Amino acid sequence: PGFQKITLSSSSEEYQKVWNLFNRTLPFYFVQKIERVQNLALWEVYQWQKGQMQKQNGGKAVDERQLFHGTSAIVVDGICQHNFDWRVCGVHSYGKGSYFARDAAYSHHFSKSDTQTHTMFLARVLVGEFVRGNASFVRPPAKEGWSNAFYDSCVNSVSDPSIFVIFEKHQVYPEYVIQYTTS
Amino acid sequence: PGFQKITLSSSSEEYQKVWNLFNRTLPFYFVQKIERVQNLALWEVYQWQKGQMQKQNGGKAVDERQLFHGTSAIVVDGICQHNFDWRVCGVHSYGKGSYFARDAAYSHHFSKSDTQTHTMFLARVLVGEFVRGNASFVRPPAKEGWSNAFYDSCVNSVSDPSIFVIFEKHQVYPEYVIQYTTS
Numbered sequence: 001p002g003f004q005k006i007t008l009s010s011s012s013e014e015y016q017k018v019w020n021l022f023n024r025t026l027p028f029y030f031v032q033k034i035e036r037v038q039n040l041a042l043w044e045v046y047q048w049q050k051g052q053m054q055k056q057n058g059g060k061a062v063d064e065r066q067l068f069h070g071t072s073a074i075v076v077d078g079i080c081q082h083n084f085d086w087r088v089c090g091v092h093s094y095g096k097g098s099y100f101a102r103d104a105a106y107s108h109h110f111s112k113s114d115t116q117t118h119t120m121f122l123a124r125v126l127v128g129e130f131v132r133g134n135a136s137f138v139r140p141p142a143k144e145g146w147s148n149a150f151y152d153s154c155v156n157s158v159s160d161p162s163i164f165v166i167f168e169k170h171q172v173y174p175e176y177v178i179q180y181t182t183s
Numbered sequence: 184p185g186f187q188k189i190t191l192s193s194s195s196e197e198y199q200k201v202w203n204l205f206n207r208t209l210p211f212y213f214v215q216k217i218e219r220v221q222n223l224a225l226w227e228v229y230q231w232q233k234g235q236m237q238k239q240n241g242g243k244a245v246d247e248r249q250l251f252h253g254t255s256a257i258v259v260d261g262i263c264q265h266n267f268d269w270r271v272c273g274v275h276s277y278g279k280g281s282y283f284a285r286d287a288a289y290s291h292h293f294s295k296s297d298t299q300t301h302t303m304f305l306a307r308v309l310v311g312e313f314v315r316g317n318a319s320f321v322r323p324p325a326k327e328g329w330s331n332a333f334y335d336s337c338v339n340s341v342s343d344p345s346i347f348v349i350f351e352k353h354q355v356y357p358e359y360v361i362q363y364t365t366s
């Protein structure tokens with residue numbers, strides 16, 4: 001089995017936090033469901049990655065963000081079980097990694113349906129320290145002035161990031177599935 | 184459940200037919216397993232599509248081919264349950280459709296692993312009547328001199344095709360999964 005999706009009540013704090021983040025940039029759309037994803041196997045490897053990044057950061061808390069990923073309904077269960085893996089599709093770019101967006105409105109362009117109902121993840125991402133990306137990058141580049149340290153993620157802007165590229169699947173947990181309609 | 188994968192004995196006729204087709208263009212590689220995919224739901228919709236194409240062809244047999252598709256191991260079960268759907272990834276082309284290759288050696292470029300073991304489908308495809316494709320095509324174009332008939336698939340060459348683009352998932356059954364190594 002591996003995972004459960006728990007449908008949230010729309011009057012719950014947990015639902016309202018996810019809804020608020022979605023509604024911030026897709027206010028003209030209508031949310032039909034929000035499910036919490038429970039996959040203890042994906043959460044264990046995420047927490048292990050986090051502990052490794054925390055140690056490498058002097059023992060201080062790693063930069064961790066909730067970021068959107070628009071998908072097709074048909075892969076949702078595959079991602080809840082196996083996580084995001086950019087190697088399924090490739091990219092043809094800010095890096096050959098999985099992409100996540102700050103804005104639901106940006107991830108909406110990648111939620112394909114042929115139907116009224118669209119699906120989007122809100123994922124938990126250990127972005128850590130980031131730098132601008134490049135379409136050649138297969139992993140994040142070295143930090144200047146360090147002989148033995150690399151960035152954790154690539155972005156569009158360091159002063160103002162809105163897209164993140166993740167090269168390691170253990171840096172992501174697919175935390176929530178959002179179903180919505182555009183009318 | 185939906186599907187079973189039945190591992191074939193390597194001394195069976197059924198295994199030798201698949202192996203022969205793979206070995207034709209990847210003779211330097213080593214096949215480790217061949218599984219027959221049994222999904223009665225995917226086979227029913229394939230046979231219904233076939234009957235529709237047969238009626239449209241004057242009741243005569245539709246052009247049907249065994250064509251390769253290289254994948255990652257992580258989507259194999261998803262395809263055995265849900266079939267090929269090009270809308271998972273998009274294309275960025277001979278058409279926005281699922282691609283299949285005559286030659287295993289060509290599909291090998293899309294079998295990603297980070298391991299020794301690679302995976303490839305041999306799918307059953309109702310290619311029907313075909314015409315050259317184009318990166319704009321979202322479905323196959325009209326037949327010249329017909330007011331109410333379209334092609335069934337797009338290709339690279341009509342006199343000599345080697346790549347097929349399929350826009351309708353009911354035109355494909357994922358019949359066999361091939362695992363092989365490159366050493």
Ligand SMILES: C[C@@H](COCCC(=O)N1CCN(c2ncc(C(F)(F)F)cn2)CC1)Nc1cn[nH]c(=O)c1C(F)(F)F
Pocket residue numbers: 068069070071075077078079080082083084085086087088089090091097098099100101106107108110111163257258261
């Ligand atoms: C510009 C575009 C680039 O996208 C890069 C592709 C990507 O990141 N992928 C695709 C394949 N994937 C996956 N597929 C099936 C499975 C399972 F489980 F079935 F095997 C697992 N993983 C992991 C995610 N950016 C997108 C693309 N899609 N959605 C957005 O939100 C965004 C962006 F940029 F807005 F965040």
Ligand SMILES: C[C@@H](COCCC(=O)N1CCN(c2ncc(C(F)(F)F)cn2)CC1)Nc1cn[nH]c(=O)c1C(F)(F)F
Pocket residue numbers: 074075078251252253254258260261262263265266267268269270271272273274280281282283284289290291293294346
């Ligand atoms: C040039 C390249 C263009 O490929 C076009 C993409 C394509 O056809 N796809 C990708 C996504 N897909 C799928 N993904 C996950 C699922 C599930 F179940 F997880 F949801 C279902 N469907 C259906 C197939 N051509 C390839 C690409 N890959 N392999 C080859 O052999 C070839 C070619 F051309 F050599 F035949």
Ligand SMILES: [Cl-]
Pocket residue numbers: 084085086097098166167168169
């Ligand atoms: Cl990834």
Ligand SMILES: [Cl-]
Pocket residue numbers: 267268269280281349350351352
């Ligand atoms: Cl398709």
